[PDB]
Write an enzyme that holds these catalytic residues in place. Structure first.
Site, PDB file in Angstrom:
ATOM      1  N   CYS A   1     -32.125  -6.094  32.961  1.00 20.35           N
ATOM      2  CA  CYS A   1     -33.254  -7.150  33.396  1.00 20.35           C
ATOM      3  C   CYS A   1     -33.998  -7.650  32.274  1.00 20.35           C
ATOM      4  CB  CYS A   1     -34.322  -6.298  34.382  1.00 20.35           C
ATOM      5  SG  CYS A   1     -33.620  -5.429  35.740  1.00 20.35           S
TER       6      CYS A   1
ATOM      7  N   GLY B   1     -30.566  -1.926  33.540  1.00 20.87           N
ATOM      8  CA  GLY B   1     -31.052  -2.192  32.275  1.00 20.87           C
ATOM      9  C   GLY B   1     -30.894  -3.642  31.730  1.00 20.87           C
TER      10      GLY B   1
ATOM     11  N   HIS C   1     -41.932  -6.580  36.779  1.00 23.36           N
ATOM     12  CA  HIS C   1     -41.560  -5.394  37.374  1.00 23.36           C
ATOM     13  C   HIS C   1     -41.297  -4.149  36.453  1.00 23.36           C
ATOM     14  CE1 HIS C   1     -37.099  -5.133  36.489  1.00 23.36           C
ATOM     15  NE2 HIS C   1     -36.901  -6.481  37.206  1.00 23.36           N
TER      16      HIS C   1
HETATM   17  C1  LIG Z   1     -34.082  -0.858  44.148  1.00 21.41           C
HETATM   18  C2  LIG Z   1     -34.988  -1.275  42.937  1.00 21.41           C
HETATM   19  O1  LIG Z   1     -36.275  -0.887  43.048  1.00 21.41           O
HETATM   20  N1  LIG Z   1     -34.568  -2.172  42.089  1.00 21.41           N
HETATM   21  C3  LIG Z   1     -33.561  -1.575  41.065  1.00 21.41           C
HETATM   22  C4  LIG Z   1     -33.869  -1.866  39.621  1.00 21.41           C
HETATM   23  C5  LIG Z   1     -33.980  -3.608  39.580  1.00 21.41           C
HETATM   24  C6  LIG Z   1     -32.761  -4.038  39.651  1.00 21.41           C
HETATM   25  O2  LIG Z   1     -32.169  -4.684  40.800  1.00 21.41           O
HETATM   26  N2  LIG Z   1     -31.860  -3.929  38.527  1.00 21.41           N
HETATM   27  C7  LIG Z   1     -30.773  -4.378  38.424  1.00 21.41           C
HETATM   28  C8  LIG Z   1     -30.269  -5.767  37.728  1.00 21.41           C
HETATM   29  N3  LIG Z   1     -29.082  -6.307  37.709  1.00 21.41           N
HETATM   30  C9  LIG Z   1     -27.958  -5.389  38.124  1.00 21.41           C
HETATM   31  C10 LIG Z   1     -27.993  -4.015  38.405  1.00 21.41           C
HETATM   32  C11 LIG Z   1     -26.963  -3.237  38.726  1.00 21.41           C
HETATM   33  C12 LIG Z   1     -27.338  -1.890  39.330  1.00 21.41           C
HETATM   34  C13 LIG Z   1     -28.583  -1.436  39.537  1.00 21.41           C
HETATM   35  C14 LIG Z   1     -29.775  -2.424  39.124  1.00 21.41           C
HETATM   36  C15 LIG Z   1     -29.486  -3.593  38.591  1.00 21.41           C
HETATM   37  C16 LIG Z   1     -34.830  -4.047  40.557  1.00 21.41           C
HETATM   38  C17 LIG Z   1     -35.674  -5.267  40.335  1.00 21.41           C
HETATM   39  C18 LIG Z   1     -36.223  -5.884  41.379  1.00 21.41           C
HETATM   40 CL1  LIG Z   1     -37.291  -7.258  40.966  1.00 21.41          CL
HETATM   41  C19 LIG Z   1     -36.538  -5.179  42.781  1.00 21.41           C
HETATM   42  C20 LIG Z   1     -35.739  -3.973  43.053  1.00 21.41           C
HETATM   43  C21 LIG Z   1     -35.120  -3.585  41.753  1.00 21.41           C
END
Ligand SMILES: CC(=O)N1CC[C@@H](C(=O)Nc2cncc3ccccc23)c2cc(Cl)ccc21
Ligand SMILES: CC(=O)N1CC[C@@H](C(=O)Nc2cncc3ccccc23)c2cc(Cl)ccc21
Ligand SMILES: [Cl-]
Ligand SMILES: [Cl-]
Lengths: 305, 301
Positions: free
Chosen positions: A145, A143, A41
């Site tokens: 990930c 951040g 991603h």
């Molecule tokens: C809504 C979206 O597009 N996101 C966000 C970025 C990202 C995500 O989850 N990141 C985060 C990871 N670990 C804690 C996190 C606390 C707070 C915020 C984000 C965190 C993500 C990754 C996937 Cl595979 C699917 C969706 C999303």
């Protein structure tokens, strides 16, 4: 004496953490030999995440679109490929700090250490368990990930997890190092929810053995039970079934403490139907399920790495 | 989201762990530059342990009596000196993995990561607080002496603890890296007992702010309290008094959540009065006191 939630020493993994930037997205990569692994991603924008075609997005990328940074040195990407939900960036330099390592997929209940990172820099290490609903109850901000979960066996790092996302309930989801998700999750901006969690029964028993090794015996009783009577009671309290494999694995702790597994299950059965009654076990008022039987033996016997 | 007891990455400290042997005793040493620091009780013959004269014992030792092992390499001891309860063994090789470091003495309530070691090999990393009674509730076995406590706030390792001993109640006592013990403890087998432990109140408040930041609000109430009324209630539950310094330190979390410190203090008073009633705060059924206000801000951002 004492019992703590203890992670493996993170040094061998710290020497592998790098920062991966693609467009506006910056996350963590794991640099092993001449390959950097990271969540696929990283190639997505806000719109892309809603319904992504990762093969289509990756084909539009060139090696120079990926900016890999190891400390203050920029690594040059000479290739890119995708394996499930993980992106593999071939670099021109082999990581000289590459430890002896393996990629392993773990089962629910198994524990591992997480090296939480931001911008390719390790910020913390914590011990957690792969929940029976395949989520991890982690501590992660935006951040994080690409942060990895691992165990250490002798001098070998077994990488078992890579962080990808946070679910709406604050719990976390990710993949093994081959990009296969743990749990029925997808790497998309869509409605996803973890299944109802259950308690890791074998781990609770292991932790009760650690409490006995530490002198905490109030919960012990004269009773024993069958695996069948215990499982009927346990299933009612949203506890995972205890198999004969679990009973066998608890054998060494049973021998060390003189309390048979079915004897300890009778203590656990009472703890469930009656509570702690104001008392604690190892300073905890709840039954702890994030210590496996191997974790307990390792800690209560001093295995080093 | 999420809140975990989190240790600093231990890599910078792993590269400093060595094994120190003197006679029949083997424990851990911390190798920084060309000096190995370790508990001075490594020179004791267990018979000297009740009333040791460490100056007398050290004067009888020579450099070749100390066997220092870094990995599979034996380091050559070219000098020995004592600073309080720590032995400093000068070696003929500077540790190439020496990180940027400082020696810091911490106060009760402060947290740190412990790299538990045996025979100079790191076995685990966990998180501790220096208890108000100056002990630490560690997880240590025989051979863990010389294991160190540290913090790694930005590039630099601040060494704050070296493990020396286990008290009769299973709690642990040790020194700063200058050999000064935390608390009224001595490095002798003489009868020693930790004072009654108390809860680190400022840390519980910080953890209640972390729970609010994470969406837990069930314990919040419409009450506020004076600082003196709060301390009167808190002392009855063996909680440390909350000073104006502690109220000031909780200011940023108070501003971030919109809950005044004395407002959160009223929630804490209610929690001590009623208990949790089957509910948990951040997955815990007990009030957690091993997260400082600084740990909460760092972890939650
Ligand atoms: C809504 C979206 O597009 N996101 C966000 C970025 C990202 C995500 O989850 N990141 C985060 C990871 N670990 C804690 C996190 C606390 C707070 C915020 C984000 C965190 C993500 C990754 C996937 Cl595979 C699917 C969706 C999303
Ligand atoms: C009683 C005694 O002579 N000892 C023991 C060795 C040593 C000691 O406490 N070692 C241990 C440390 N940390 C966990 C330990 C779990 C189990 C056993 C020993 C542990 C020691 C050090 C001093 Cl400064 C004073 C006394 C003693
Ligand atoms: Cl298991
Ligand atoms: Cl908030």
């Amino acid at each position: 004496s004492g019992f703590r939630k203890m992670a493996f020493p993170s040094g061998k993994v710290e020497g592998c953490m790098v920062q991966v930037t693609c467009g506006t997205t910056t996350l963590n990569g794991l640099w092993l030999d001449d390959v950097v692994y990271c969540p696929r991603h990283v190639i997505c924008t806000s719109e892309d995440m809603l319904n992504p075609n990762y093969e289509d997005l990756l084909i539009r990328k060139s090696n120079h679109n990926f900016l890999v940074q190891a400390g203050n040195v920029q690594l040059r990407v000479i290739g890119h490929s995708m394996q499930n939900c993980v992106l593999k960036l071939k670099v021109d330099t082999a990581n000289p700090k590459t430890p002896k390592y393996k990629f392993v997929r773990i089962q629910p209940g198994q524990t591992f250490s997480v090296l939480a990172c931001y911008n390719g820099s390790p910020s913390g290490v914590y011990q957690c368990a792969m929940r029976p609903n395949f989520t991890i109850k982690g501590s992660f901000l935006n951040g994080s990930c690409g942060s990895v979960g691992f165990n250490i066996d002798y001098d070998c790092v077994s990488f078992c997890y890579m962080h990808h996302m946070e679910l709406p309930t604050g719990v976390h989801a990710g993949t093994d190092l081959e990009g296969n998700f743990y749990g029925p999750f997808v790497d998309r901006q869509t409605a996803q929810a973890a299944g109802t969690d259950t308690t890791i029964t074998v781990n609770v028993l292991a932790w009760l053995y650690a409490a006995v090794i530490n002198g905490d015996r109030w919960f012990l009783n004269r009773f024993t039970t069958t695996l069948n009577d215990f499982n009927l009671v346990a299933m009612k309290y949203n506890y995972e079934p205890l198999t004969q494999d679990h009973v066998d694995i608890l054998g060494p702790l049973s021998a060390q403490t003189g309390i048979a597994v079915l004897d300890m299950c009778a203590s656990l059965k009472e703890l469930l139907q009656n509570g702690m009654n104001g008392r604690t076990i190892l300073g905890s008022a709840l039954l702890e399920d994030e210590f496996t039987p191997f974790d307990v033996v390792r800690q209560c016997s001093g295995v080093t790495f």
